[PDB]
Amino acid sequence: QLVESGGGLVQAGESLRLSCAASVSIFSINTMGWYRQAPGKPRELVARIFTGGSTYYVDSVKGRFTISRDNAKNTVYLQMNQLKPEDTGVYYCRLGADYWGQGTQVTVSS
Amino acid sequence: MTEYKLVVVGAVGVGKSALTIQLIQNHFVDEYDPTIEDSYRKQVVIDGETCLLDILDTAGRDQYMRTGEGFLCVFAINNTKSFEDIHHYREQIKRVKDSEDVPMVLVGNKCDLPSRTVDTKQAQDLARSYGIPFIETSAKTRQGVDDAFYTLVREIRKH
Ligand SMILES: Nc1nc2c(ncn2[C@@H]2O[C@H](COP(=O)(O)OP(=O)(O)O)[C@@H](O)[C@H]2O)c(=O)[nH]1
Ligand SMILES: [Mg+2]
């Protein structure tokens, strides 16, 4: 069971914090990722955090997005700053291999 | 800026994820989940030319083989079965893309390990029979990692 929140309609330049809260402990899960599908485009990996703490960001969001995990809260976050219209899409958290959030809409207007 | 669509193929457990993550993150990630298949994008400088690598780390379709421009065919040097599967991946890639010249690099990973069941002449002989380079790697120590991906980009530039 994953509770997803933090999306919404914002103007360009504003920020959102996407959240993915699990009912179960996430401590044993070694990697977490955030995905998105924009209109007319295939799903893409936006950010991933690995064991040891290093993080990957797709080139389009590098410098604006931050992925983090809060083990004691069983929650994974995606901080999205300096939002652009092209950031519009449905965002999905993925905990490990097969725990997928059912999505949250992010819409960025000019 | 030129984008290169790379695909890492090979039997499960040969180190495809460990290689890809070492290139992207410069960290060895132990026992990465074997079913996770992701594409990573990374801006790099190869031979003085800045370019972007779009790398698909497969997890074991005909679509992503058609989209791919170059393929890393990985086996582990302590897994003879993974070495014998190599010709299956090359044949299956040559079938979807309909070409006799698909940029390709043979990669022998886990060279940090002493118990080696596939020796260098075997791998070089197979690579030479294909007309493709052979690069030895260790995702654990990062030996040869950049070399393997950069050699494949050079193979795409010839094509
Ligand atoms: N010693 C050693 N182990 C490796 C190397 N590359 C990968 N491994 C290990 O081999 C196992 C499978 O690697 P993985 O990247 O998941 O293989 P994949 O299924 O092809 O993605 C993991 O436990 C890795 O830690 C290497 O260069 N040296
Ligand atoms: Mg893998």
Numbering used by the authors:
A (entry chain AA0A): 3 to 112
B (entry chain R): 1 to 60, 68 to 166
Provide passages from the article that reported this PDB entry:
RAS GTPases (H-, K-, and N-RAS) control many cellular processes by switching between an inactive GDP-bound state and an active GTP-bound state and represent the most frequently mutated oncoprotein family in human cancers. In this study, we exploited the unique properties of Nbs either to disrupt or to stabilize the SOS1cat•KRASG12V signaling complex (further referred to as SOS1•RAS) to modulate the nucleotide exchange rate of KRAS. The SOS1-catalyzed nucleotide exchange reaction is a complex multi-step process involving the binding of RAS•GDP to the catalytic site of SOS1 (KD1 = k−1/k1), followed by the release of GDP to yield a nucleotide-free SOS1•RAS complex (KD2 = k2/k−2). To highlight the power of this platform technology, we describe the discovery of four representative Nbs, including competitive disruptors but also connective and allosteric stabilizers of the SOS1•RAS complex.
Reciprocal to Nb77, Nb84 was collected from the Q3 subset of yeast cells. Nb84 binds to the switch-1 loop of RAS (KRASG12V•GDP), preventing interactions with SOS1 and causing competitive inhibition of the SOS1-catalyzed nucleotide exchange reaction. Remarkably, this RAS-specific Nb further inhibits the intrinsic nucleotide exchange of RAS, locking it in a fully inactive conformation. We hypothesize that the interactions of Nb84 with the switch-1 loop of RAS prevent the conformational changes required to exchange the nucleotide, very similar to the conformation-locking antibodies discovered by the Evangelista lab15. As expected, ectopic expression of Nb77 and Nb84, which inhibit SOS1•RAS nucleotide exchange, led to lower levels of ERK phosphorylation after serum stimulation.
